[PDB]
Scaffold this active site. Structure first.
Site, PDB file in Angstrom:
ATOM      1  N   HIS A 133       0.823  -1.204   0.000  1.00 40.77           N
ATOM      2  CA  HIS A 133       0.000   0.000   0.000  1.00 40.77           C
ATOM      3  C   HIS A 133       0.858   1.256   0.000  1.00 40.77           C
ATOM      4  CE1 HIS A 133      -3.110   2.729   2.169  1.00 40.77           C
ATOM      5  NE2 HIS A 133      -3.304   2.772   0.864  1.00 40.77           N
TER       6      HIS A 133
ATOM      7  N   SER B 272       0.558  -0.968  -6.474  1.00 38.53           N
ATOM      8  CA  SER B 272       0.594  -2.238  -7.184  1.00 38.53           C
ATOM      9  C   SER B 272       1.404  -2.108  -8.472  1.00 38.53           C
ATOM     10  CB  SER B 272      -0.821  -2.730  -7.475  1.00 38.53           C
ATOM     11  OG  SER B 272      -1.512  -3.041  -6.279  1.00 38.53           O
TER      12      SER B 272
ATOM     13  N   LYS C  61     -13.804  -9.647  -8.907  1.00 35.71           N
ATOM     14  CA  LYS C  61     -12.791 -10.540  -9.464  1.00 35.71           C
ATOM     15  C   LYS C  61     -12.202 -11.450  -8.390  1.00 35.71           C
ATOM     16  CE  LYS C  61      -9.756 -10.136 -13.430  1.00 35.71           C
ATOM     17  NZ  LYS C  61      -8.639 -11.075 -13.143  1.00 35.71           N
ATOM     18  N   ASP C  62     -11.946 -10.902  -7.198  1.00 35.83           N
ATOM     19  CA  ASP C  62     -11.464 -11.717  -6.091  1.00 35.83           C
ATOM     20  C   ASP C  62     -12.524 -12.684  -5.585  1.00 35.83           C
ATOM     21  OD1 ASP C  62      -8.907 -10.611  -6.122  1.00 35.83           O
ATOM     22  OD2 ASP C  62      -9.477  -8.988  -4.760  1.00 35.83           O
TER      23      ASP C  62
ATOM     24  N   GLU D  32       6.574 -34.468   1.658  1.00 41.48           N
ATOM     25  CA  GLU D  32       5.443 -34.083   0.825  1.00 41.48           C
ATOM     26  C   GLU D  32       5.937 -33.423  -0.463  1.00 41.48           C
ATOM     27  OE1 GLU D  32       2.742 -32.059   4.000  1.00 41.48           O
ATOM     28  OE2 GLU D  32       1.780 -33.899   3.293  1.00 41.48           O
TER      29      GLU D  32
END
Ligand SMILES: CCCCCCCCCCCCCCCCCC(=O)OC[C@H](COP(=O)([O-])OCC(O)COP(=O)([O-])OC[C@@H](COC(=O)CCCCCCCCCCCCCCCCC)OC(=O)CCCCCCCCCCCCCCCCC)OC(=O)CCCCCCCCCCCCCCCCC
Ligand SMILES: CCCCCCCCCCCCCCCCCC(=O)OC[C@H](COP(=O)(O)OCCN)OC(=O)CCCCCCCCCCCCCCCCC
Ligand SMILES: CCCCCCCCCCCCCCCCCC(=O)OC[C@H](COP(=O)(O)OCCN)OC(=O)CCCCCCCCCCCCCCCCC
Ligand code: HEM
Ligand code: HEM
Lengths: 72, 47, 380, 31, 49, 64, 15, 101
Positions: free
Chosen positions: C201, C205, C227-228, C271
C-alpha cells in the site's frame, strides 16, 4: 489518492452503461480468434521446455523399466 | 479405512450442484461490472 | 453533513485499503492468487482451531487421536482433509504468487520481497512441522533424518535437540513443542502478511506491462472485489474437489501406519512441495552442504532483485529471458520429479545436472540474457 | 422455495445413480 | 529383488466419481473377516457402533 | 469359481501365450544346472501382468 | 474545436 | 552487419511492444535517472508518451493488440529519451566522481 497521481492532457474517454450493452457481445465468434492469436504468440516460448522435460521424464522411466531386464 | 465415503460423495454432489448454480451468476456479475471498462474508447487530440 | 465513509475513524482505514484504493486496470488473474493466498491462510487457521478445540493430541497416541478424529468425531475427516489439502493449495498458490513476482518484474520492491522471503521461510517451517505432528511411520523417519541434519551445528543444533525432544526416540513429552509453535507461528505469518500489505500500500501495485500505471488506474471496488470473489469461489471449488473426491491423490499412503522405529520404510520422501528441495539434499554429498544449499536457494531467490541488469522491468518484451524463465520452471518440475524418485542411476546425475542448471539459470544466465537483450535493442 | 428442492434433487440423483447399493435400499431383508 | 508387479484396476462398484459402496458386500466381507481373518489380524480403530 | 473361468477363457490371448512359452523355454534352460543365481522371474511377472490385465478387463461380470 | 468530436459507434456492444 | 541488422529487426518485431503501439523509449523501467529524464522532457513528447502508455494499458486490459497497419514500424521508432537519459547519466557519473574524491 485519486486526483494527485499523474498529469495527463488532451485525452478523451468514452464509456457506456452496463445496462445499455450486452454482457457477452459476440462471445465465441470474437473470442476464439483472440485466444488462438494469444496461443500462437505464446506457445512457441512456453511449450518447448515442457516438451523437452516430458521427453526427459519418459526417458527416465524407460531406463527405470529397462534397469536390469535379466541381464545376460 | 474410509467409513465416510458415501457421505463424502454426497457432499461432493451437493458441492457440484451449488457451484453450477453459483459460478455462472458470479461470472455474469463480473462481466456486467467490467463491461464499462471493456467498452471504453480512448482518443487523443493534441492542439 | 459529512461523508461517513471518509470521516469515520475506523472506516477510512478500510476504504483507503479496500474501496477507493487505486489499482492498475490491466491486472490479469495472476495477482488474484495473492488474495487467494490470504483467504487460504485464514481457512487453515480455522481448520487448525477445529484441530485443537475438540481434540487431544498426545505424545504417544497421536495417531490414535487422529483416527478417532476421522471416525468418532462428527465431520472430523472433512476438517482434517481440508487442513491437508489447504496446505497443498496454499503451496500451489504461493508458488504461483512467487512465480508472478519473479516473471513480471515485481522484485523491484525491496522490503516487500524481503518480508515475502521471510514469509516463505515461515510457511516452510509450519508445513514441515505440521507434517511431523500426526506421528506416522515415514513422518517419524523424516523428522529423525532432518533432525540428524540439523544436529550438526554446535550449541544451536544439539541444545535445541534436547529442547524440542525430551529423548531421541520417545519419552513422556515429545511432540508438544512441535505442536506449540506450529500453533503460534501462522499468526506471525498473518502479522507478516499485514506488513506485506502495508508495504505494498505504501508502494502501490504493479501492472503486467511493468510500466508506470498512473495514467490508467481504477478503484478496487467493484472491479477487483468481484474478481477476487470469483477467484475465491473457483479456488474453493478446486479445494474441496481435492478434499471431497480425491483425498489421497496429493497425499501418500506411507504415513497411514503407526510409527515403529524398528521398521525401516522402503521408500522415504517428504510431501510434494518439499520434494525438489529434498532433491538438493540428494545433489551435494554433504549434510551441511545440503542445508546451506537449501538456504542458498532461498537466498538467491532473495538476491534476484540485485541481478536485474535490464532496463525493462517486466518480461513481456523480453523473449530470451522468457525462454530462460520457462526452462527454469520446467527445471523445477524436473526437480520435483527427481526428488520423488529414490537415489539410484541415473537419477543422481539428473539431480546434479538439474541443480547446476537451476543455479546457473538464476545466477548467471538471466543477467547475461538481459545484457544480450539490451545490446540487441540499441540501448547500449 | 429452492433449498429443500435442492437437497431433495441432489439426494434423488444420488440414489438414482446408486440404486440398489445404499443401506436404505436394503432395509427390507436385513431388518 | 527390487522387481515388483503393478496390480491392474478392477472395475469396482465404488470406482466412479459418484459411485457408492455396495453395503451388502461390506456386510459379507465383515463376516468373512469375523469368520476367517479375525484369528490373526485386528481392527483396532473400528468399533461395533 | 469364475476367475478360473476367466483364466482359461482368456489364456489363449497371443501376448500371454507368448510370455507363457518364454516361461517354459526359461524353465528348460534353468534346469541345466548352470550353478548360477539366474531365475525365470521377469517373464513370470510379464505373463502374470498380461493375464491380470485380462482378468481386470472382464472379471466382475459373472460375480455377484 | 470541441464541436469537431463525436462519440464512436458502439453498435457492436449495444443491445 | 546486414544479417545482424536483420536479426535485430526480427527481434524488435518479436519483442512485442510494437503490437501495443509503444515506442522503444516508453518501455524503460522508471528508475531515478529515468524519472528526471522524463521530468526534463518537453510537453508534446511527454503528452504523446502518456497517451501511448494509457493506450498500451487499455489494450493489455482487454488482451488485444493494434491492427497491423497501426503497429510501430522500425523506421519511426526514434530515440527521443536517449539524449536526456544520457546527459542525466553523465551528470550523475560526474557527481559520483566528485563525491568519491
Ligand atoms: C475453446 C474454449 C472456450 C474459449 C472461449 O469461450 O473464449 C471466449 C473468451 C475469450 O476472451 P477474450 O476475448 O480473450 O477476452 C477476455 C479475456 O479472456 C479476459 O476476460 P475473462 O472473461 O477471461 O475474465 C478474466 C478471468 C478472471 O479470472 C478469475 O477470476 C480467476 C482467477 C484465478 C483462479 C485460480 C484458482 C486456482 C487455480 C489453480 C490451478 O476469467 C477467467 O479466468 C474465467 C473464469 C470462468 C469461470 C467459470 C465461468 C462459467 O474466453 C474466456 O472468456 C475465457 C474463459 C471462458 C470460461
Ligand atoms: C502457466 C503456463 C504458461 C501460460 C502462458 O502461456 O502464459 C503466458 C504469459 C505471458 O504472457 P504476457 O507476455 O504476459 O502477455 C502477452 C499479451 N500480449 O505467462 C504468464 O503470465 C506467466 C505468469 C506466471 C509465471 C510463473 C508460472 C510458474 C509458477 C511457479 C514458479 C516457481 C518459482 C520458484 C518457487 C520456489 C522457490
Ligand atoms: C515457426 C512456427 C511454428 C508453428 C507453425 C504455425 C505458425 C504459428 C504462429 C507463429 C508466429 C511467429 C512466431 C511468434 C512467436 C515469437 C517468436 C519466437 O518465439 O521465436 C522463436 C524463438 C526465437 O528466439 P527469440 O527469443 O525470438 O530470439 C532470437 C535471438 N537469437 O525460439 C524459441 O522460442 C525456441 C526456444 C527453444 C528452447 C528449448 C529448451 C530445451 C532445453 C530445456 C531443458 C530444461 C530442463 C533441463 C534439465 C537438466 C537436467 C537433465
Ligand atoms: C495455527 C493454526 C494451525 C493449527 C492449530 C494447526 C494444527 C495442526 C494439527 C493439530 C495437525 C495434526 C492433525 C492432522 O494431521 O490432520 C496439523 C497438521 C498439519 N498442518 Fe497444521 N495447523 C495450523 C496451521 C497450518 C498451516 C498454516 C499449515 C500450512 C503451512 C499447516 C500445515 C499442516 C500440515 C501439512 C499438516 C499435516 C496434515 C497431514 O497429516 O497430512 N497447518 N496442523
Ligand atoms: C505468505 C503468503 C503470501 C500472502 C498471503 C501474500 C499476499 C499478498 C497480497 C494479498 C498481495 C496483494 C495482491 C496483489 O496485488 O498481488 C500480494 C502482493 C505481492 N506479493 Fe505477496 N503474499 C504472500 C507471499 C509472497 C511472497 C513469498 C512474495 C515474494 C516472492 C510476495 C511478493 C509479493 C509482491 C511482489 C506483490 C506485489 C504484486 C505486484 O504489484 O506486482 N508475496 N501478496
Amino acid at each position: 489518492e485519486f486526483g494527485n497521481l499523474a498529469r495527463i492532457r488532451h485525452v478523451i474517454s468514452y464509456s457506456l452503461s452496463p445496462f445499455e450493452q450486452r454482457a457477452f457481445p459476440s462471445y465465441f465468434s470474437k473470442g476464439i480468434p483472440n485466444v488462438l492469436r494469444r496461443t500462437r504468440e505464446r506457445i512457441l516460448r512456453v511449450a518447448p521446455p515442457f516438451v523437452v522435460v516430458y521427453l526427459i521424464y519418459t526417458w527416465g522411466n524407460q531406463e527405470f523399466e529397462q534397469s536390469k531386464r535379466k541381464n545376460p | 479405512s474410509e467409513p465416510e465415503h458415501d457421505h463424502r460423495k454426497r457432499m461432493g454432489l451437493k458441492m457440484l450442484l451449488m457451484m453450477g448454480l453459483l459460478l455462472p451468476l458470479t461470472y455474469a456479475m463480473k462481466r456486467h461490472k467490467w463491461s464499462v471498462l471493456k467498452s471504453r474508447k480512448l482518443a487523443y487530440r493534441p492542439p | 453533513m459529512t461523508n461517513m465513509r471518509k470521516t469515520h475513524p475506523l472506516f477510512k482505514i478500510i476504504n483507503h485499503s479496500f474501496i477507493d484504493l487505486p489499482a492498475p486496470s490491466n491486472i490479469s488473474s495472476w495477482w488474484n492468487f495473492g488474495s487467494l493466498l490470504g483467504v487460504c491462510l485464514m481457512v487453515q487457521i480455522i481448520t487448525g482451531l477445529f484441530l485443537a478445540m475438540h481434540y487431544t493430541s498426545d505424545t504417544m497416541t497421536a495417531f490414535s487421536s487422529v483416527t478417532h478424529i476421522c471416525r468418532d468425531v462428527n465431520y472430523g475427516w472433512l476438517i482434517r482433509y481440508m487442513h491437508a489439502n489447504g496446505a497443498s493449495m496454499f503451496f500451489i498458490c504461493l508458488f504461483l504468487h512467487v512465480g508472478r513476482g519473479l516473471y513480471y518484474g515485481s522484485y523491484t520492491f525491496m522490503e516487500t520481497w524481503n518480508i515475502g522471503v521471510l514469509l516463505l521461510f515461515a510457511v516452510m517451517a509450519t508445513a514441515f512441522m505440521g507434517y511431523v505432528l500426526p506421528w506416522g511411520q515415514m513422518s517419524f523417519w523424516g523428522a529423525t533424518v532432518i533432525t540428524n541434519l540439523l544436529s550438526a551445528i554446535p550449541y544451536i543444533g544439539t541444545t535445541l535437540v534436547e529442547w524440542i525432544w525430551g529423548g531421541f526416540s520417545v519419552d513422556k513429552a515429545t511432540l508438544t513443542r512441535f505442536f506449540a509453535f506450529h500453533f503460534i507461528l501462522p499468526f506471525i505469518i498473518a502479522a507478516l502478511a499485514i506488513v506485506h500489505l502495508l508495504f505494498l500500500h505504501e508502494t502501490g501495485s504493479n501492472n503486467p506491462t511493468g510500466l508506470n500505471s498512473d495514467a490508467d488506474k481504477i478503484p478496487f471496488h467493484p472491479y477487483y472485489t468481484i474478481k477476487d470473489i470469483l477467484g475465491i469461489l473457483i479456488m474453493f471449488l478446486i479445494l474441496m474437489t481435492l478434499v471431497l473426491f480425491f483425498p489421497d491423490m496429493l497425499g501418500d499412503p506411507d504415513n497411514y501406519m503407526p510409527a515403529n522405529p524398528l521398521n525401516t520404510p522402503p521408500h522415504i520422501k517428504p510431501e510434494w512441495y518439499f520434494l525438489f528441495a529434498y532433491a538438493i539434499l540428494r545433489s551435494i554429498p554433504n549434510k551441511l552442504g545440503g542445508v546451506l544449499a537449501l538456504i542458498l536457494s532461498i537466498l538467491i531467490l532473495a538476491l534476484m532483485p540485485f541481478l536485474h541488469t535490464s532496463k525493462q522491468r517486466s518480461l513481456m518484451f523480453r523473449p530470451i529471458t522468457q525462454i530462460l524463465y520457462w526452462i527454469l520452471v520446467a527445471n523445477l518440475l524436473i526437480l520435483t520429479w527427481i526428488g520423488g524418485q529414490p537415489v539410484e542411476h541415473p537419477f543422481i546425475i539428473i539431480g546434479q545436472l538439474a541443480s547446476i542448471s537451476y543455479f546457473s539459470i538464476i545466477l548467471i544466465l538471466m543477467p547475461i540474457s538481459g545484457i544480450i537483450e539490451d545490446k540487441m535493442l540499441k540501448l547500449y | 422455495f429452492f433449498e429443500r428442492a435442492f437437497d431433495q434433487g441432489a439426494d434423488a440423483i444420488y440414489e438414482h445413480i446408486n440404486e440398489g447399493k445404499l443401506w436404505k435400499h436394503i432395509k427390507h431383508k436385513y431388518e | 529383488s527390487d522387481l515388483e508387479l503393478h496390480p491392474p484396476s478392477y472395475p469396482w462398484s465404488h470406482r466412479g466419481l459418484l459411485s457408492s459402496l455396495d453395503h451388502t458386500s461390506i456386510r459379507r466381507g465383515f463376516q468373512v473377516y469375523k469368520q476367517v481373518c479375525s484369528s490373526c489380524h485386528s481392527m483396532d480403530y473400528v468399533a461395533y457402533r | 469359481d469364475p476367475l478360473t473361468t476367466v483364466r482359461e477363457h482368456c489364456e489363449q490371448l497371443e501376448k500371454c501365450v507368448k510370455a507363457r512359452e518364454r516361461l517354459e523355454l526359461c524353465d528348460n534352460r534353468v534346469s541345466s544346472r548352470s550353478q548360477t543365481e539366474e531365475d525365470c522371474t521377469e517373464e513370470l511377472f510379464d505373463f502374470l501382468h498380461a493375464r491380470d490385465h485380462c482378468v481386470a478387463h472382464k472379471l466382475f461380470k459373472n460375480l455377484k | 474545436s470541441h464541436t469537431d468530436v463525436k462519440v464512436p459507434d458502439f453498435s457492436d456492444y449495444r443491445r | 552487419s546486414k544479417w545482424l541488422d536483420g536479426f535485430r529487426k526480427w527481434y524488435y518485431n518479436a519483442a512485442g511492444f510494437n503490437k501495443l503501439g509503444l515506442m522503444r523509449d516508453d518501455t524503460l523501467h522508471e528508475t531515478e535517472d529515468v524519472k528526471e529524464a522524463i521530468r526534463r522532457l518537453p510537453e508534446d513528447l511527454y503528452n504523446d508518451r502518456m497517451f501511448r502508455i494509457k493506450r498500451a494499458l487499455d489494450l493489455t486490459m482487454r488482451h488485444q493488440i493494434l491492427p497491423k497497419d497501426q503497429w510501430t514500424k522500425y523506421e519511426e521508432d526514434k530515440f527521443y529519451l536517449e539524449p536526456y537519459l544520457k546527459e542525466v547519466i553523465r551528470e550523475r557519473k560526474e557527481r559520483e566522481e566528485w563525491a568519491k574524491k
